[PDB]
Amino acid sequence: GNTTSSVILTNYMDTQYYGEIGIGTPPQTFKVVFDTGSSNVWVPSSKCSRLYTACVYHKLFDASDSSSYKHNGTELTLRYSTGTVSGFLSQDIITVGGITVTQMFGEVTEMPALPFMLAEFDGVVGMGFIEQAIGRVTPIFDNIISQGVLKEDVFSFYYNRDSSLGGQIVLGGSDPQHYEGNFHYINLIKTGVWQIQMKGVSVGSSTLLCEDGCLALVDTGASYISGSTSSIEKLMEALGAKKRLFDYVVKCNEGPTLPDISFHLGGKEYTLTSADYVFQESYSSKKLCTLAIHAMDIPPPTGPTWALGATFIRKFYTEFDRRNNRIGFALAR
Amino acid sequence: GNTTSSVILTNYMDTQYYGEIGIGTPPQTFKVVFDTGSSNVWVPSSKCSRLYTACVYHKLFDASDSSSYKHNGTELTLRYSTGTVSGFLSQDIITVGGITVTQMFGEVTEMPALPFMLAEFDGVVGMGFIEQAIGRVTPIFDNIISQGVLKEDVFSFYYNRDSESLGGQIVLGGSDPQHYEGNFHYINLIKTGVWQIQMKGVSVGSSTLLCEDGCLALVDTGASYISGSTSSIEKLMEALGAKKRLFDYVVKCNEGPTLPDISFHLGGKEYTLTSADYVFQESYSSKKLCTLAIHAMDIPPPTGPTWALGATFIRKFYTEFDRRNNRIGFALAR
Ligand SMILES: CC(C)C[C@H](O)[C@H](O)[C@H](CC1CCCCC1)NC(=O)[C@@H](CC(=O)N(CC(=O)N(C)C)[C@@H](C)c1ccccc1)Cc1csc(N)n1
Numbered sequence: 296g297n298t299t300s301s302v303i304l305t306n307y308m309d310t311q312y313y314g315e316i317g318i319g320t321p322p323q324t325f326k327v328v329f330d331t332g333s334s335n336v337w338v339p340s341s342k343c344s345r346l347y348t349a350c351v352y353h354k355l356f357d358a359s360d361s362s363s364y365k366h367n368g369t370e371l372t373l374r375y376s377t378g379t380v381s382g383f384l385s386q387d388i389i390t391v392g393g394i395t396v397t398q399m400f401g402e403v404t405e406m407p408a409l410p411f412m413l414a415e416f417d418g419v420v421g422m423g424f425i426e427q428a429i430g431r432v433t434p435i436f437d438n439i440i441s442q443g444v445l446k447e448d449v450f451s452f453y454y455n456r457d458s459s460l461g462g463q464i465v466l467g468g469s470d471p472q473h474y475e476g477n478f479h480y481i482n483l484i485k486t487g488v489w490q491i492q493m494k495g496v497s498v499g500s501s502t503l504l505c506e507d508g509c510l511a512l513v514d515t516g517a518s519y520i521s522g523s524t525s526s527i528e529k530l531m532e533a534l535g536a537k538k539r540l541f542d543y544v545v546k547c548n549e550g551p552t553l554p555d556i557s558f559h560l561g562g563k564e565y566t567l568t569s570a571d572y573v574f575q576e577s578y579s580s581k582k583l584c585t586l587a588i589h590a591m592d593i594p595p596p597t598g599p600t601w602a603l604g605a606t607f608i609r610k611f612y613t614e615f616d617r618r619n620n621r622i623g624f625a626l627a628r
Numbered sequence: 629g630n631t632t633s634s635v636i637l638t639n640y641m642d643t644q645y646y647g648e649i650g651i652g653t654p655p656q657t658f659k660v661v662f663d664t665g666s667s668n669v670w671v672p673s674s675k676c677s678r679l680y681t682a683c684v685y686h687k688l689f690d691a692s693d694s695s696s697y698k699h700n701g702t703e704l705t706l707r708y709s710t711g712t713v714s715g716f717l718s719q720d721i722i723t724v725g726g727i728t729v730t731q732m733f734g735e736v737t738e739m740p741a742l743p744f745m746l747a748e749f750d751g752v753v754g755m756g757f758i759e760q761a762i763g764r765v766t767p768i769f770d771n772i773i774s775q776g777v778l779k780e781d782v783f784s785f786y787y788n789r790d791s792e793s794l795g796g797q798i799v800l801g802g803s804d805p806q807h808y809e810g811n812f813h814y815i816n817l818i819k820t821g822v823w824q825i826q827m828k829g830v831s832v833g834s835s836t837l838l839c840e841d842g843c844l845a846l847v848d849t850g851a852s853y854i855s856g857s858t859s860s861i862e863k864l865m866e867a868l869g870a871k872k873r874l875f876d877y878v879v880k881c882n883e884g885p886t887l888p889d890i891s892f893h894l895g896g897k898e899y900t901l902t903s904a905d906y907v908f909q910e911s912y913s914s915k916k917l918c919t920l921a922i923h924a925m926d927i928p929p930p931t932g933p934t935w936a937l938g939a940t941f942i943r944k945f946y947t948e949f950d951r952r953n954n955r956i957g958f959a960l961a962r
């Protein structure tokens with residue numbers, strides 16, 4: 296068809312980006328995270344206990360209120376790198392932008408404080424493929440395609456640096472207002488995951504890692520870029536950042552001194568200068584500044600893999616092309 | 629007819645949206661706000677006393693330089709919710725978005741510093757009905773409607789979010805499909821003469837906490853914030869745990885991102901604002917107060933008492949003001 300649906304995104308501290316969706320009739324509105332790293336749609340259930348403070352502090356779905364609702368009740372546990380959520384599976388109509396589709400989705404009943412008490416949004420909308428779908432429920436994008444409608448079988452993401460417009464997702468295409476140049480594509484290693492092959496990470500001048508290829512997930516639901524523990528160690532040493540309990544820090548004023556990091560993808564370099572990978576809250580010689588790179592050990596079958604998260608997507612407007620199973624990149628604006 | 633014309637607006641910090649017009653021959657250019665809550669056109673006059681500092685800081689209109697001017701002289705006072713200006717009527721040629729009308733406007737000679745010294749713009753273009761016109765002078769849109777050039781008898785508003793982009797835009801004669809998505813939902817006005825509509829309820833969180841039984845809502849582009857009566861905003865504010873500063877309501881910045889949705893039940897549909905939509909999240913500090921883009925305003929009868937949906941609302945919802953059929957349509961802006 297010749298349609299395109301923009302979804303406005305809020306950016307909260309550059310770590311969380313979310314937009315609204317409406318479930319039901321008349322719709323209920325939830326804040327969600329559009330995650331290319333998974334394929335299930337889930338929101339909190341009014342049937343969630345207050346025992347969990349997470350539910351107590353999150354919008355909940357009230358099936359009673361939905362004209363269009365449909366019982367189902369299959370139980371489900373969705374497991375994320377950072378947490379787990381369990382609930383059961385309902386159906387209703389979900390409103391995304393100007394689009395509407397009958398979605399099967401989970402109504403969450405168990406949600407831990409760690410990490411959900413740190414989430415500002417309510418649930419998540421899996422932009423992944425059906426192969427990774429807990430319960431072989433069809434992911435929302437699949438359902439949207441079916442309905443014809445969209446001009447192209449792709450979706451794009453723009454993430455902004457927090458200061459304005461926090462970001463934007465375009466279903467059916469891309470916004471030429473939010474990127475410079477033209478896209479360069481990198482094919483999927485295999486279908487089922489949004490993961491491409493990378494063939495080197497350079498620190499400044501030199502390929503320091505992933506010399507003979509490695510994998511990268513392009514993950515819109517990952518705050519930071521991660522790499523295996525061993526690569527991050529190596530990398531940080533080369534940068535001279537230091538482990539501070541949780542993260543790697545650098546003296547604020549020394550931020551500008553760090554080298555550029557380049558990801559070699561599909562024959563091109565994607566370069567990040569320290570300004571893109573250090574959160575320079577100051578430039579004081581008296582303060583420590585945080586790096587938005589973290590180690591993450593992803594289990595097979597998926598990992599060991601690099602995950603290119605919001606850190607990278609802030610820099611490169613991203614296009615996920617389902618038609619050709621390829622991911623494209625252009626410099627954002 | 630067949631024209632469609634647009635005015636591009638500048639967005640000053642989310643609170644002032646102004647476009648330009650030209651008056652006279654040769655044209656004298658002015659920054660103006662296009663306001664649906666009023667129907668007069670005015671600019672500051674070269675006759676304005678320099679004793680009004682607002683008249684030292686804004687472009688003044690000088691008839692002595694205009695060949696197309698026709699003197700009128702009739703005095704007129706313009707009262708707005710937040711201030712007043714006085715002047716007299718003049719007539720000259722006004723160019724808006726490419727359209728040229730011979731318009732009767734006011735030359736303001738008395739301009740107070742509050743609010744005007746805070747104004748990035750010079751005057752106002754009232755986009756309301758002749759019913760609201762001081763002096764019974766014909767409103768500009770109506771004059772345009774007389775020319776028979778517009779494709780449609782509508783005008784729409786796009787208000788954008790800022791930057792460190794295109795500020796907003798008025799389309800004269802239609803709408804702009806690049807700035808909205810989905811379909812319009814039309815509400816009919818209660819009656820001609822005022823851009824007001826029936827509202828059945830306002831919800832904080834879940835609960836139609838307010839406006840049970842029903843209320844009025846003015847859709848007014850000439851207002852930065854959304855406004856309710858004082859007693860309604862009193863309730864609202866308490867629900868959000870907001871704290872009344874001089875002229876505004878505030879909240880601890882850190883509390884900001886979790887404030888509950890507020891819904892406006894209009895024409896059977898529900899218009900929802902999320903915390904992101906109505907809090908000026910200028911920081912996350914637990915140690916700073918952040919402004920809410922909502923406030924009280926007691927509008928006297930006949931229009932009031934009412935709610936007024938200002939730039940806060942229009943920002944999320946593209947608005948079409950339809951004269952042909954006397955109605956307002958909202959769509960989801962993009
Ligand atoms: C194949 C897997 C790598 C896919 C992965 O499970 C999914 O992308 C999953 C989706 C998330 C959507 C919001 C609800 C939590 C889960 N992201 C994740 O699990 C990433 C979560 C994630 O990015 N965060 C923030 C974070 O890590 N930093 C550094 C702020 C966690 C704290 C989170 C949790 C809850 C609310 C908000 C944030 C961790 C990660 C893995 S690889 C990497 N670079 N980062």
Ligand SMILES: CC(C)C[C@H](O)[C@H](O)[C@H](CC1CCCCC1)NC(=O)[C@@H](CC(=O)N(CC(=O)N(C)C)[C@@H](C)c1ccccc1)Cc1csc(N)n1
Pocket residue numbers: 643644661663664665666707708709710711743744746747748752848849850851852853854855925927931936937938
């Ligand atoms: C029937 C009436 C409600 C109609 C009302 O008089 C008109 O819409 C009137 C026209 C304005 C055009 C710009 C010059 C000032 C006057 N707007 C208004 O009076 C709104 C003015 C208005 O919104 N402002 C900004 C303001 O209130 N804040 C909080 C930034 C005034 C203070 C202002 C000051 C400085 C510069 C510019 C504007 C106040 C309001 C009333 S209902 C509501 N939600 N907000």
